[PDB]
Ligand binder design. Structure first.
Ligand SMILES: O=C1C[C@H]2CCC[C@@H](CN1)N2c1ncnc2[nH]c(Cl)cc12
Length: 167
């Protein structure tokens, strides 16, 4: 039993809700919140910009130190950093950005990072400003993640479409 409330159950291990991941994180304080990161951990917009803003830029300060030490992530890769006031940990995961020409096949590799954590709160990778089809992202999530994932979908219209079209 966990503290996630109001989710629709899609499969044995995947749950979905129309919610703002920022507000959901602040309420649940999950062990792991997933960020829709880029390889530079520059959290300017989309989910990343929103999460970083909620940490009062502490996420960005920590991220800049991480990059200065380690260099950029790989597309499809991840790193674990602090969750600040939102969660114990933040798993920064880089899905391919279609608006940069990146290989959509890397989306499965991106979701594989979730399997290193028993329970996560997460957005749909590569959705939103990353330019991928959120319906496809949900399919890859369901077919790749085996741990317990709670998906927050900000747009109510998109949420309804994701539920109504789910096979
Ligand atoms: O539902 C979506 C899809 C998903 C990936 C693309 C960017 C946005 C757009 N809307 N996003 C979010 N997901 C969950 N929480 C969110 N909070 C804020 Cl602000 C945005 C946001």
């Amino acid at each position: 039993v966990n503290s996630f409330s109001g989710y629709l159950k899609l499969t044995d291990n995947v749950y979905i809700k129309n919610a703002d991941i920022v507000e959901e994180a602040k309420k649940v304080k999950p062990t792991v919140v997933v960020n829709a990161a880029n390889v530079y951990l520059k959290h300017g917009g989309g989910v990343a910009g929103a999460l970083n803003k909620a940490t009062n830029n502490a996420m960005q300060v920590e991220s800049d130190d991480y990059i200065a030490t380690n260099g950029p992530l790989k597309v499809g890769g991840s790193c674990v950093l602090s969750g600040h006031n939102l969660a114990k940990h933040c798993l920064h995961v880089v899905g391919p950005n279609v608006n940069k020409g990146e290989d959509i096949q890397l989306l499965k590799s991106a979701y594989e990072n979730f399997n290193q954590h028993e329970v996560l709160l997460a957005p749909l990778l590569s959705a939103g400003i990353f330019g991928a089809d959120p319906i496809h992202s949900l399919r890859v999530c369901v077919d790749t993640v085996r741990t317990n994932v709670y998906l927050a979908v900000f747009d109510k219209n998109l949420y309804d479409k994701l539920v109504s079209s789910f096979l």
